[PDB]
Amino acid sequence: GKMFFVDLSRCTACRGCQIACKQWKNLPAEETRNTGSHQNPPDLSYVTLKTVRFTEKSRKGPGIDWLFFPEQCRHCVEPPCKGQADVDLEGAVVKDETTGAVLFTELTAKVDGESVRSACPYDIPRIDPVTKRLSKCDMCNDRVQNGLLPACVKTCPTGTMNFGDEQEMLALAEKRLAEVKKTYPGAVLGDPNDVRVVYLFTRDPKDFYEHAVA
Amino acid sequence: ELQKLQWAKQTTSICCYCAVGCGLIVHTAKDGQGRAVNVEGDPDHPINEGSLCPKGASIFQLGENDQRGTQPLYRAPFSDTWKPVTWDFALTEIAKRIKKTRDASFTEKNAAGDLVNRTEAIASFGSAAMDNEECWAYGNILRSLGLVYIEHQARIXHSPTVPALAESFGRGAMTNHWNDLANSDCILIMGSNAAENHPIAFKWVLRAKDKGATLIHVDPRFTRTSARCDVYAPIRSGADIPFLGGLIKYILDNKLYFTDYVREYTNASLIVGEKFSFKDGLFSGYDAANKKYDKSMWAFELDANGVPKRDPALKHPRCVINLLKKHYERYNLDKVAAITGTSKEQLQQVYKAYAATGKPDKAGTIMYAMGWTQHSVGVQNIRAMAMIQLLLGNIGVAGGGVNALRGESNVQGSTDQGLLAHIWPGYNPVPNSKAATLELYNAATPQSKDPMSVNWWQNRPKYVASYLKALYPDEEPAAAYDYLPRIDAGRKLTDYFWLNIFEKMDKGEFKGLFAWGMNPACGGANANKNRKAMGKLEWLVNVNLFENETSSFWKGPGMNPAEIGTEVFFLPCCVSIEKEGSVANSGRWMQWRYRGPKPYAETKPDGDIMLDMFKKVRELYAKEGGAYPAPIAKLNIADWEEHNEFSPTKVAKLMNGYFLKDTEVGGKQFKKGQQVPSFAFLTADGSTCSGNWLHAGSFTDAGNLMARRDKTQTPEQARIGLFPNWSFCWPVNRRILYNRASVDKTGKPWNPAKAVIEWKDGKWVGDVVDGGGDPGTKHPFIMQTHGFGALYGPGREEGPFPEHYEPLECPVSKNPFSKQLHNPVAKAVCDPRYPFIGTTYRVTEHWQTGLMTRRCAWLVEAEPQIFCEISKELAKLRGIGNGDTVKVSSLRGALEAVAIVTERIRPFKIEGVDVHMVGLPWHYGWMVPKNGGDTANLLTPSAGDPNTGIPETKAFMVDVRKVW
Numbered sequence A: 001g002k003m004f005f006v007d008l009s010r011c012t013a014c015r016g017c018q019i020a021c022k023q024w025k026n027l028p029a030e031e032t033r034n035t036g037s038h039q040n041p042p043d044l045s046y047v048t049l050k051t052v053r054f055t056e057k058s059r060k061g062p063g064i065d066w067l068f069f070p071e072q073c074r075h076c077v078e079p080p081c082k083g084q085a086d087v088d089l090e091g092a093v094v095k096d097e098t099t100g101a102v103l104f105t106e107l108t109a110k111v112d113g114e115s116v117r118s119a120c121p122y123d124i125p126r127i128d129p130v131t132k133r134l135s136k137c138d139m140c141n142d143r144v145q146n147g148l149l150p151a152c153v154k155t156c157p158t159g160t161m162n163f164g165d166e167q168e169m170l171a172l173a174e175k176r177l178a179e180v181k182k183t184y185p186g187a188v189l190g191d192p193n194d195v196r197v198v199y200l201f202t203r204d205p206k207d208f209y210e211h212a213v214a
Numbered sequence B: 001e002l003q004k005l006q007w008a009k010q011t012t013s014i015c016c017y018c019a020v021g022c023g024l025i026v027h028t029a030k031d032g033q034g035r036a037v038n039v040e041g042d043p044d045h046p047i048n049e050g051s052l053c054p055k056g057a058s059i060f061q062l063g064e065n066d067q068r069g070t071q072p073l074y075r076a077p078f079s080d081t082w083k084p085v086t087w088d089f090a091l092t093e094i095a096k097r098i099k100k101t102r103d104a105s106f107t108e109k110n111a112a113g114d115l116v117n118r119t120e121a122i123a124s125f126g127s128a129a130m131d132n133e134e135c136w137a138y139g140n141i142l143r144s145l146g147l148v149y150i151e152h153q154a155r156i157x158h159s160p161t162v163p164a165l166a167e168s169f170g171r172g173a174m175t176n177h178w179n180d181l182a183n184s185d186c187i188l189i190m191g192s193n194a195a196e197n198h199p200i201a202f203k204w205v206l207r208a209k210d211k212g213a214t215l216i217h218v219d220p221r222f223t224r225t226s227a228r229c230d231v232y233a234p235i236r237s238g239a240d241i242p243f244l245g246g247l248i249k250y251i252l253d254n255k256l257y258f259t260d261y262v263r264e265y266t267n268a269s270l271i272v273g274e275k276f277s278f279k280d281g282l283f284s285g286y287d288a289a290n291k292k293y294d295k296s297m298w299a300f301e302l303d304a305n306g307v308p309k310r311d312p313a314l315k316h317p318r319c320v321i322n323l324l325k326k327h328y329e330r331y332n333l334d335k336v337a338a339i340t341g342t343s344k345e346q347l348q349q350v351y352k353a354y355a356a357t358g359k360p361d362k363a364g365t366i367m368y369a370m371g372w373t374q375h376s377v378g379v380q381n382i383r384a385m386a387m388i389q390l391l392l393g394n395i396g397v398a399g400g401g402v403n404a405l406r407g408e409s410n411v412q413g414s415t416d417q418g419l420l421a422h423i424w425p426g427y428n429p430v431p432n433s434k435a436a437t438l439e440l441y442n443a444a445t446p447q448s449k450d451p452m453s454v455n456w457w458q459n460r461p462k463y464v465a466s467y468l469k470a471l472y473p474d475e476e477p478a479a480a481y482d483y484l485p486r487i488d489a490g491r492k493l494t495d496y497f498w499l500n501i502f503e504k505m506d507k508g509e510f511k512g513l514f515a516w517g518m519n520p521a522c523g524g525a526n527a528n529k530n531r532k533a534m535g536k537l538e539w540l541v542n543v544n545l546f547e548n549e550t551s552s553f554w555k556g557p558g559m560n561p562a563e564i565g566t567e568v569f570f571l572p573c574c575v576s577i578e579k580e581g582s583v584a585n586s587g588r589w590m591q592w593r594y595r596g597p598k599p600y601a602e603t604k605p606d607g608d609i610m611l612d613m614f615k616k617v618r619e620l621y622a623k624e625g626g627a628y629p630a631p632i633a634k635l636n637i638a639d640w641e642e643h644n645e646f647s648p649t650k651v652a653k654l655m656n657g658y659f660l661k662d663t664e665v666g667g668k669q670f671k672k673g674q675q676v677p678s679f680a681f682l683t684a685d686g687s688t689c690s691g692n693w694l695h696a697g698s699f700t701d702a703g704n705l706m707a708r709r710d711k712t713q714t715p716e717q718a719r720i721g722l723f724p725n726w727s728f729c730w731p732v733n734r735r736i737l738y739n740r741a742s743v744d745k746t747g748k749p750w751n752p753a754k755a756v757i758e759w760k761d762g763k764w765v766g767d768v769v770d771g772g773g774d775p776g777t778k779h780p781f782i783m784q785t786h787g788f789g790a791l792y793g794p795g796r797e798e799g800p801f802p803e804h805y806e807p808l809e810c811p812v813s814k815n816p817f818s819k820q821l822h823n824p825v826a827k828a829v830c831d832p833r834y835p836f837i838g839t840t841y842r843v844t845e846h847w848q849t850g851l852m853t854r855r856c857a858w859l860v861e862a863e864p865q866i867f868c869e870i871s872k873e874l875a876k877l878r879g880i881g882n883g884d885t886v887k888v889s890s891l892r893g894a895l896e897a898v899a900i901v902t903e904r905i906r907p908f909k910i911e912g913v914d915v916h917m918v919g920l921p922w923h924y925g926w927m928v929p930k931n932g933g934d935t936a937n938l939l940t941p942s943a944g945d946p947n948t949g950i951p952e953t954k955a956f957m958v959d960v961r962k963v964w
C-alpha cells in the first residue's frame, strides 16, 4: 500500500496544496469571509477536501509558534467510516487493495451520512446538503495508479508532503523524526501504525487541531 | 491513462507570477487545438521540481476564466458605459491619437538649442509582466515615437538595488541564483518575506537547513517565513543600517573577516585622499545650500600613472579598511540594541551565526526584496549588506552572494530592455541633451590605467553601435544616434520617473498615457490623487487581462463619468500560457515558454498589439507626413515578424544579434547573417547588430540556448546546482557572478567541497569564469573601473560608507549616531490625529494589486477581503476585537478592513514611547470581488524622494478606529 509522510516542521502554509487539490478535481470555491484569520475555508466541506488550519501559540520573547495543519482523510488501515457505511449498504465506502486508499462512491447518498461522519475519529467526512453524497480526500487514487504523485504532494515546495510505498515512508518518518527532534524536541508521529497519512507534529498534536490524532 | 489528460497536448511554460521562474506543464484539449484542461508543475524543472505555490497552482483558473477581456472596449468622453469595438477600430483610433499628440507636442530642440527629438505629451507605464521580446520591442516603439517618460514596476522595488550593487560589485544583478541557496551555511532574510513572496525559494532554504545552515529572519513582523527560521529577530521599521553597521563593527572587532579575500579582492588596500572626512553625520564636501556633496572630495590618492594607490599591508591610516573600522566604531551593541529594539542577546546570536561565515569554507547569503528600501537611504541599506558580504568573502562563492530577490517573473528582463526613463537596453544610459554626438556619448565611460583591471564597460561603444544597427540597420550608428529622444541634462533625473509622471498628470501636463500591463489606479501611492489625475488625460490606453480599477477609473467610487472627459481604450491581452517567448528570472535565467491554448476569444499577445499599433502609426506618417518622421519610418520591424505575426523567435535572434557583413573579430572569421556567439564579438563599426548586448550568446548558430531543457551536469556543477545546460543566463551563462573571487591567486577554490570554478589543466572548470585570464592575472570584479569589490563606494550620493539617517520622521527627533537626524541630501506633516505607523505588504495567495488573483475564485476563497493586522496592545488601546470591522484613515484617504489581532505584531519602543504598527495588504480594489475592499494605496503618501522618485508604502501615518 501507499503512505503520505507529512513533515509539519517544514510547512510555510503557502496553501499550494489547498489550491492544487481544487485545480486537479476542478472543485468550486466556497463563499468565504475574513473573520479575523488567514484560515479559509474555515473547515472541510463537500467541495473542500483539504484546508490549511492556522493556530498561533504564545511563546516567551519575540514572535509566536505558528502551527500549520493541512488537513485530509488519513486513509485508515481499518477505516471506521467503512464499518459504519457497510451497516446501511456495502460498496458506499471501499478500500483499494493496491494503494490502500479509502474511497467514497456515489452509493454514499443511500447511507446515513451523519452517522459515517460520527464514526470517523478524525471528523473527516462531509455531506452534500443537496445529494447527501459524502466527500473527502480520495488520495488522488487515479493519479497514484497512473504513477503520478497526488496533486497536493507534487505541488508542495518545502518537502512537507512526501508520498510512496508504506515501507519507504515509515522508514523516512522514523529517520526524519530523529533529525527533527534536534530542532523540536517534543516532535511526535500521528497514529503511525493505524493510518496512511502520517503527520510529524513539532509538539502536542492537539495544538495543531482537536482531531489531529484519534 | 488519466482521462483528464488523454487527447490533450502537453507543452512547457514558466509561471507568470514571481521571479523564482517555476516550470509548468500545460495540457491543451484537442491535441493543442482547444482550451487548457490542466496546468501544474513541471517535474523535470530544476528550480521547482514540479512544486508550485497557490499562485502558480491556480494558473488554469487565471487562463480559463469567463471574466477575462474578450475584445477591445471603447469609452467615449463623458460616457458612463463601454462600447465593444473591433481591433481595427481600436488600433486605428489609438494610432491617430498617438500621431495627433506627437505632431502637436514634438520638440526637435529644447530651450537651450540642444537636439532632443522628443514628445513630453505621452507617458507609458509597464510592464514586468510582458515577455522579454515584447519588452524590447515595446521600448523601441515608444522611443521611435520620441517618448522619454517610460517607466514600470522596476522603479519601486528594483531601482535602488542596481546602483548599490553596481557601486559594490560592478553589476546591479542578483549575484547568485535560487538553487544556490541550498549551498549556504547561514541564510539572513532581511527586508524579505520569501516563504510568502518567493515560496519555492524555501525548497532550497530548507535544503540548506538540512545540511546544517542557520536560518535567520529579521523583520518588524512575525510572518510565515519567521515560522520556519531558526532565529526570528524583530527590528523597528527603518533601523536596518544600525543593525548592519553593528554587524560590520562586530566583524572587524572580532577579526572574523576573510583576511586574504579582503586584502586581494576588495578595495580595503586603496588609499583614500586626505580630503575625505566624516564628522557629526556629514562627509567632507557638503554643500548645505544645494543639500548635495562634492564627491571629488572622496577621491582616491592616485599614483604617477592615475591608478589608485594601494597599501597591501593595510597599515596606512587612509587605507579603505582603516577608514571603515573608524566609521563603524560608533555602532556598539548597546546603541544598536536601543534603536533596533533587538535585544543585545539576539544581536550577539545573529552576529555570531552570520559572521562565522567569514571562514573560507563557510558561506553566508543575504536575501532581501522590496522590504523597506523605498526611503532615501535604501541604496545605503543594500550597500551595507554588500560590504558585510565582501568582509566575509561571501561574494562569488556557492551559498554566498547578495540575493536581491526580483519581484515579477520578468522585472529582470523588462529592466534589461530599458523600460525605465534613464536606460536603453543593456543598461546603456538614455542620452541627455549635452550628449550631442555618439562620440561624446562614448567619451563619458571611465578608463583604467591598471593593466590588471579588465574594466569591461570600455566595450560600451560596441554595444551602443550594435543597438543602433538593430533599430536602424541601413544607417551609420552616428546618424541613427539622432533618431532617439534625449532627456534634459539640466533637470533632476527623477523628473522623468514614476512619482513625477503622476505629479505631471495631476497638473494636466500629459495628453496620453499607456497603462500597459499595470494597474496604476491601485499600484500608485495616494490612489485618490492618481484616480482624479487620470481624468486630466485626453486618452488612456490600458492593455490588460481583465477590466480593472485603471481601465474603469472613470466609474470608480466617488467618480461621475459625465464630468470625466478621458477617452479610454481597453485592449485585452492573452495570458502567459497562450504565448511563446522568454522571461528572465531573479537569477538571470532567460527561460523559453511555449503556447498551450490559442488566445482566449479575441485577446492578443502584447507583441501583436504593439506591432499592429505601430504599423498603423507608420501608415499614417506615410500618408499624412508629420513631425520628424525618420525615427518611425526607418525602424527595422521586418526582423520582428513572420507569417503576418509578431515573432518571439526572430526578435530573440535580433536581441542576440547577427553579423551585417563578413567580419574578422577576436581572431575568428564570421560570415554575413551568422548569429553573434557572444558580446565579445560585437563591433563599434556597424559590422554587428544586437538589440541587447547582454543577450549576445543566448541565441547563436547553435540555436535557442534559452530553450535548453538539459539537466546534464559534471560532479562539480551538480554539487552546487549550476544546471548550466538548463536555459541560459546573462552574462554568457555565468550562473554565479564574480566567481573569480571564489578562488585564490593559483585558481584553487577557497572551498573545494563547494567549488564554483577551479583552474585544472590550463582551463577554468565548473561555472563559466566571470572574466577570462590565468589565475592571479586579473582583478576579480571585471565591471568595476578599478577591479575591486567596493567597501568604500564614493559614487553614492549619500556618501562612500552607509550611515544611519532616520527614514521615520513622525516618531523620531534624535539620531543616536550623529547630530544629523535625516538624510542630508534628501515635508511629512505628522498630524497627531494619525498616531500609528501604517505599512503595506503581501500575502502568499494574492499578486500585486490583486487585479489577477481577485479574479481567481480559489485565491479569493483563501484571502477574500482586505484585513488590518494589529497587536493585542493596539487592540486593547482602541477596543478592537479580532474580526471587528475597523476604519483605517490617513491625511490621504480612508478604508474599512477586518481586524486581525495577533502577537505577530508587537509595539516599537521609540525615544521612550510605545509606537504601534498597523499592517494592510495592498491586494484589494473596488472592482472585484464583492466586499473585497479597496486599495491600501488610498492611505499612502505621494511624498517620495528627490534621490529615488519612490513613494513611502512601508511606513506612513494612520489612525485605526472600530466601526459599529
Ligand SMILES: Nc1nc2c(c(=O)[nH]1)N[C@H]1C(S)=C(S)[C@@H](COP(=O)(O)OP(=O)(O)OC[C@H]3O[C@@H](n4cnc5c(=O)[nH]c(N)nc54)[C@H](O)[C@@H]3O)O[C@H]1N2
Pocket (backbone or CB within 6 Å): B018, B153, B157, B190, B191, B192, B193, B194, B196, B197, B198, B218, B219, B220, B221, B223, B235, B236, B237, B238, B239, B240, B368, B369, B370, B371, B372, B406, B407, B408, B839, B840, B841, B842, B843, B844, B845, B846, B847, B848, B849, B954
Ligand atoms: N505572494 C506574493 N509574492 C510576491 C508579490 C505579491 O504581490 N504576492 N509581489 C512580488 C513583487 S512585485 C515584489 S517587488 C516582491 C517584494 O517582496 P518582499 O520585499 O518580500 O515584500 P513585502 O511583503 O512587501 O515586504 C517584505 C517584508 O519587509 C518587512 N519590512 C517592512 N519594513 C521593514 C523595515 O524597515 N526593515 C526590514 N528589515 N523589513 C521591513 C515587512 O514586514 C515584510 O514582511 O515580492 C514579489 N512576490
Ligand SMILES: Nc1nc2c(c(=O)[nH]1)N[C@H]1C(S)=C(S)[C@@H](COP(=O)(O)OP(=O)(O)OC[C@H]3O[C@@H](n4cnc5c(=O)[nH]c(N)nc54)[C@H](O)[C@@H]3O)O[C@H]1N2
Pocket (backbone or CB within 6 Å): B016, B127, B129, B130, B131, B153, B154, B156, B157, B370, B407, B408, B516, B517, B518, B519, B520, B523, B524, B525, B543, B544, B545, B546, B573, B574, B575, B576, B606, B840, B841, B847, B848, B849, B850, B851, B852, B922, B936, B937, B940, B953
Ligand atoms: N502600497 C503599495 N503599493 C505598491 C507596492 C507595495 O508594496 N505597497 N509594491 C509596488 C511594486 S514593487 C510593484 S511591482 C507594483 C505593481 O503594480 P502593478 O504592476 O500595477 O500591479 P498589477 O497590475 O496587479 O500587476 C499585474 C498586472 O500584470 C498584467 N499582466 C499579466 N500578464 C500580462 C501579459 O501578458 N501582458 C500584459 N500587458 N499585462 C499582463 C495584469 O493584467 C495586471 O495588470 O505595485 C507597487 N505598489
Ligand code: SF4
Pocket (backbone or CB within 6 Å): A010, A011, A012, A013, A014, A015, A016, A017, A018, A052, A068, A070, A152, A155, A156, A157, A158, A159, A160, A161
Ligand atoms: S504545499 Fe506544502 S508547504 Fe505549502 S501549505 Fe501545503 S504542505 Fe505546507
Ligand code: SF4
Pocket (backbone or CB within 6 Å): A020, A021, A022, A024, A049, A050, A072, A136, A137, A138, A139, A140, A150, A151, A152, A153
Ligand atoms: S491527495 Fe489528492 S484528494 Fe487528497 S488532499 Fe491531496 S490533492 Fe486533495
Ligand code: SF4
Pocket (backbone or CB within 6 Å): A072, A073, A074, A075, A076, A079, A080, A081, A082, A102, A119, A120, A121, A122, A123, A124, A125, A136
Ligand atoms: S480518516 Fe475518517 S474518513 Fe478517512 S478513512 Fe479514516 S475513518 Fe474514513
Ligand code: SF4
Pocket (backbone or CB within 6 Å): B015, B016, B017, B018, B019, B020, B021, B022, B048, B051, B052, B053, B054, B055, B056, B057, B198, B199, B200, B201
Ligand atoms: S509565484 Fe513564484 S514561487 Fe509561486 S509558482 Fe509562480 S514562480 Fe513559483
Ligand SMILES: [S]
Pocket (backbone or CB within 6 Å): B128, B153, B154, B157, B406, B407, B408, B411
Ligand atoms: S516588480
Ligand SMILES: [W+6]
Pocket (backbone or CB within 6 Å): B153, B156, B157, B370, B407, B408
Ligand atoms: W515589485
